[PDB]
Amino acid sequence: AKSARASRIKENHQRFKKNIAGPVEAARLERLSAKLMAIAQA
Amino acid sequence: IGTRLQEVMARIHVATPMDGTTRETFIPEAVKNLKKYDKNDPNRRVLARDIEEANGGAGVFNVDLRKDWILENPEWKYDKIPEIFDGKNVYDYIDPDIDAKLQALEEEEERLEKEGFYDEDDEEEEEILQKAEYIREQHALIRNEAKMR
Amino acid sequence: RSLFEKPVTIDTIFEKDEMIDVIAVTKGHGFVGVTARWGTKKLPRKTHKGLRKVACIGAWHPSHVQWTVARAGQMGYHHRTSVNHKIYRIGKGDDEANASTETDLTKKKITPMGGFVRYGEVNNDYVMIKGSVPGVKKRIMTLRKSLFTHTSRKALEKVELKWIDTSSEFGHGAFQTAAEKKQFMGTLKKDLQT
Amino acid sequence: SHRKYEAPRHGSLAFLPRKRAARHRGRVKSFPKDDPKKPVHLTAAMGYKAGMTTIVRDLDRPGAKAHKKEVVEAVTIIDCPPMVVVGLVGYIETPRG
Amino acid sequence: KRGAPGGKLKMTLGLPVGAIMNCADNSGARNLYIIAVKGAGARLNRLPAGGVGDMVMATVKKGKPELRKKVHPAVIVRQAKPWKRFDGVFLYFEDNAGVIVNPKGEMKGSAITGPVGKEAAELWPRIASNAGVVM
Amino acid sequence: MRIENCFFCGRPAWPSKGITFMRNDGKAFRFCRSKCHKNFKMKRNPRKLKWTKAYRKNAGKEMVVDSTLQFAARRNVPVRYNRELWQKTLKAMERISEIRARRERVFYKKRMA
Amino acid sequence: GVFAKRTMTKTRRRLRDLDQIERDLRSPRHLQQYKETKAAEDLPGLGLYYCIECAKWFESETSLVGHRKGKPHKRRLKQLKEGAYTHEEAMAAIGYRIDNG
Amino acid sequence: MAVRAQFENSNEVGVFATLTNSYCLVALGASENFYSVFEAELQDVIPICRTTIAGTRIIGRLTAGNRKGLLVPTTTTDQELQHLRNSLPDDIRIQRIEERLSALGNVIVCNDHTALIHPDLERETEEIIADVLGVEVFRQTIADHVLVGSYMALSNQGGLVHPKTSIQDQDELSSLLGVPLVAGSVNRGSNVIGGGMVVNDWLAVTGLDTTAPELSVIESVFRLGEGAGPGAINTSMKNTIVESFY
Numbered sequence A: 001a002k003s004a005r006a007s008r009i010k011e012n013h014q015r016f017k018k019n020i021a022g023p024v025e026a027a028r029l030e031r032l033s034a035k036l037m038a039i040a041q042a
Numbered sequence B: 001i002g003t004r005l006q007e008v009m010a011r012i013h014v015a016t017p018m019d020g021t022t023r024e025t026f027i028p029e030a031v032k033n034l035k036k037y038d039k040n041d042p043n044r045r046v047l048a049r050d051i052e053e054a055n056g057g058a059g060v061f062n063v064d065l066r067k068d069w070i071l072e073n074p075e076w077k078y079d080k081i082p083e084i085f086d087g088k089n090v091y092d093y094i095d096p097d098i099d100a101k102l103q104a105l106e107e108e109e110e111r112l113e114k115e116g117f118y119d120e121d122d123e124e125e126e127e128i129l130q131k132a133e134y135i136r137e138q139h140a141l142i143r144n145e146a147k148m149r
Numbered sequence C: 001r002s003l004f005e006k007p008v009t010i011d012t013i014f015e016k017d018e019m020i021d022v023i024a025v026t027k028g029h030g031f032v033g034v035t036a037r038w039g040t041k042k043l044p045r046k047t048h049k050g051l052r053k054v055a056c057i058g059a060w061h062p063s064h065v066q067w068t069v070a071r072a073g074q075m076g077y078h079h080r081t082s083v084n085h086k087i088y089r090i091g092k093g094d095d096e097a098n099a100s101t102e103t104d105l106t107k108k109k110i111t112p113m114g115g116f117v118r119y120g121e122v123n124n125d126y127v128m129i130k131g132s133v134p135g136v137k138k139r140i141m142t143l144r145k146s147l148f149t150h151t152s153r154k155a156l157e158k159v160e161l162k163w164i165d166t167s168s169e170f171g172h173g174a175f176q177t178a179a180e181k182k183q184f185m186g187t188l189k190k191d192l193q194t
Numbered sequence D: 001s002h003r004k005y006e007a008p009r010h011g012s013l014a015f016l017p018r019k020r021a022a023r024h025r026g027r028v029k030s031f032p033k034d035d036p037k038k039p040v041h042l043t044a045a046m047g048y049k050a051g052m053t054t055i056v057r058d059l060d061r062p063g064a065k066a067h068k069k070e071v072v073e074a075v076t077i078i079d080c081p082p083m084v085v086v087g088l089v090g091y092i093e094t095p096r097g
Numbered sequence E: 001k002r003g004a005p006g007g008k009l010k011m012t013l014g015l016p017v018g019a020i021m022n023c024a025d026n027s028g029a030r031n032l033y034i035i036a037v038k039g040a041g042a043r044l045n046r047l048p049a050g051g052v053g054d055m056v057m058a059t060v061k062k063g064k065p066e067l068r069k070k071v072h073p074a075v076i077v078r079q080a081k082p083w084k085r086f087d088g089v090f091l092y093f094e095d096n097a098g099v100i101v102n103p104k105g106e107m108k109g110s111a112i113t114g115p116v117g118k119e120a121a122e123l124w125p126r127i128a129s130n131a132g133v134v135m
Numbered sequence F: 001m002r003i004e005n006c007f008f009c010g011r012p013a014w015p016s017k018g019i020t021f022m023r024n025d026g027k028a029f030r031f032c033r034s035k036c037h038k039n040f041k042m043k044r045n046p047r048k049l050k051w052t053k054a055y056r057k058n059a060g061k062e063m064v065v066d067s068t069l070q071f072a073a074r075r076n077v078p079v080r081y082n083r084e085l086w087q088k089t090l091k092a093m094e095r096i097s098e099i100r101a102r103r104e105r106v107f108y109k110k111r112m113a
Numbered sequence G: 001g002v003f004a005k006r007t008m009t010k011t012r013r014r015l016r017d018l019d020q021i022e023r024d025l026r027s028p029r030h031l032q033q034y035k036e037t038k039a040a041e042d043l044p045g046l047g048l049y050y051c052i053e054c055a056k057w058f059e060s061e062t063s064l065v066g067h068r069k070g071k072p073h074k075r076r077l078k079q080l081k082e083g084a085y086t087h088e089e090a091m092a093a094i095g096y097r098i099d100n101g
Numbered sequence H: 001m002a003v004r005a006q007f008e009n010s011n012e013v014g015v016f017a018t019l020t021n022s023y024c025l026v027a028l029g030a031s032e033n034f035y036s037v038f039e040a041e042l043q044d045v046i047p048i049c050r051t052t053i054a055g056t057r058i059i060g061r062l063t064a065g066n067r068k069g070l071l072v073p074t075t076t077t078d079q080e081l082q083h084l085r086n087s088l089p090d091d092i093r094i095q096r097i098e099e100r101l102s103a104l105g106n107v108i109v110c111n112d113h114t115a116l117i118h119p120d121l122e123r124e125t126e127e128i129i130a131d132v133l134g135v136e137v138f139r140q141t142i143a144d145h146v147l148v149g150s151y152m153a154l155s156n157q158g159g160l161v162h163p164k165t166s167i168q169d170q171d172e173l174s175s176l177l178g179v180p181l182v183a184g185s186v187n188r189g190s191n192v193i194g195g196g197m198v199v200n201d202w203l204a205v206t207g208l209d210t211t212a213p214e215l216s217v218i219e220s221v222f223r224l225g226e227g228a229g230p231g232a233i234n235t236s237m238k239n240t241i242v243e244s245f246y
């Protein structure tokens, strides 16, 4: 088994972070920051 | 004839009914008009494997089970069908002829109101119950005195 | 400075279908022997000078007890930071049907019948977290964003609730609402007495 | 002499000492790494643990056995009244941290 | 291929090594004595234990004399220890029982008496095809 | 999902509640709680245990002959989904619940005259 | 007196149910199923002496005629006269029915 | 038109599929290959439903039916029943039955005209089968096997039975059913015919390990393809069958 500290596992995780989870987290961050900005400006 | 030869003769034997009749079949007419699927054909029919490979592959693509639903109104295909309402099962109450039974239940309800199935109904009696309650309280006090002493 | 003297709601910091980290102090257990503190094997029955113990603590050199050897002491009340907990619902306090789903149309709140045991009622915004969290009831909890971008499909999954249990946790509660309980029970003696 | 049968040690030395925590309120040891290209947001919140209850979830997990099926899961309820922001702390970077 | 099947969710194991279950097929054996569980891990002092749907190695303690001197792979189809499925249901059967199979999964017998478990039927297509009640 | 009923006492069994006994003849027995399960394992009769809906039905303390109780059944023939049918069904369940409750109160008063 | 009363509620100490006994009395096929789940060489009296109501084997006809005069057999007879609890009675207790069209 | 296929490297097609003359039922899996085999053979002529029965994937051995009806066991949930009802057209009658022997695909084998059942089904279940399926019901065994739906594959063209079925049993069963019958195997000598293959009047799907002689036997008895008939078995394929299965 390849460990959690394996270089290939780290590269797979980095590709997943860049290509898949990243846009979803960015959109969620945009929505949350817009709502909290609305409170801070209200 | 040996056992193995008997088994292979049973394998080659074809059984038929003695009357010679045949069962009438139900192959639909579009089968003969179907064109045989070819992998190398560029104009081949797009399959669910092709859709899954285009939309992520096995383990990533999420299939839509309501796509092939045949409903009266095609915008009901993606509804959230209710199941639980106030501790009751909606599917237990789903009945195609529900309006007739509901109207019969209603007509029975105003009927029972007409002959008064739900209607609702003495100072001396109340006084005698109060006196009996006072007597019971006195009895309880006497019993408690006896249990104390 | 614009946020000074202002209330910040939970749904403007966190969102449904997000994994967060929960930071809390665990349940206290007091002074606990090695069998429950470290999970050591019990010695055989009627072992001299105890059996819920470790037989050899320093059987080799150096002439010291080593720091890696299991000893009796304080168990629990430890600081813990548990990661990757999925938020299943962010329910609003003013919503009178925040425990209702799309397939369960019973208008009800998140609080169980008779209230949460040893807590009370939840009358504010609440967070539903999958699984368990390090704290106990009444305990302050810190919710934190995950430090790294996630690598699991479970973090990207969308949660679709169908039903939320609201029966009594003070026993074997079989009713979600008091109306359901009265509908099952029927008419009682005190109902006519009142 | 050596141990005749191998067995891993009981407990993790990463969680030492097994003492009482120095504070009742939990401590955020590490906040997420800041990216200035992101919009401003708050990294944490408080709540109070109320209890646990039960859900039924319609699962969409491709590749899993419980895909397109109902699953029963345990959940935890955290009561979260809205916080009040009352202050602002500034931090500088020094060779001691 | 070893006998441990893939795609099996965690469940409560109720039959350790040394347990005697009933024999649910018509191969001629009456009971099965567990001597090993396929896929068992390594831990000090821990008895290897199996559950419904698991392949074990079993001897025959009573039954036909030609089956008494050999070790057979078997699949546990019923257990009496309660266990939970992913739909929240805790359940148990009234006895422990399994069926003798080969390492490839095909059964030695031709019929199964009583019901089989959903896990065993889903993991072994021959048992699912020889089951009268899937339960 | 759906709501089952306890085999022993008839109380509503919600998901992850109670336990099910699987018999070798092919029968499943759903119990809402360990009380009912242990009475079943001790082979007690629900018709004789006075806290059960079976006893109350046998003793005639439950309204059993009534037109509002004929609307709920195990439907073995499925119906094609229709949004208006489901909405009118929900309204039907609400009205049937109200009528059944007030008829049950009348039944109890006739018992306790 | 009950042998080993401490563990009589265990699953491995379970006895036959009353509705199964009613179906055994009503249908010989069900009783045949139950008897083929047992071995005749291990039964008391070679399996030749069996009381269906008690669902229990005996060493001899004398022992069977003997227990018939006892109160456990009469208890079983009274329970069977009252009728065992079934799923149909469970549905009728709550007013539930099956709609098959 | 006999096609070899696998469901997640398993040759037991009849465990995971149900094929009639008007619909197909396929078990929901982690990929689309098993669905797409049936989709490529049936290009939207009949509906194909990816369905789950009682939380399982053994719908082929848990379901039974023909072009007129479908019978699902008592442990089928209301949502699975609703999904089947919405996927199939109104011409097909779907019923959930209360049989003790809930493995309907094991206890019932049927074509559009007649059905063979396990001998221990209840009388009202027999009436429900005869009503919904619209067939004549008989209680039989396939070479002393009570699981007729797992030890026989049947269509309107013909039938393939357990390889150890006697000649007299084949003759009386063929006379009872009105279709030609042959004894043969699937999946390289497996006697589990219903678990190994599914068949309708113009398409058969067998496992990948089904060898060429038994595939030819299947095509001959089920009359699949151009110039296919059961009379080829004892005239043109006799030497092949004797060379293979001796």
Ligand SMILES: [Zn+2]
Pocket (backbone or CB within 6 Å): F006, F007, F008, F009, F010, F011, F031, F032, F033, F036
């Ligand atoms: Zn109960």
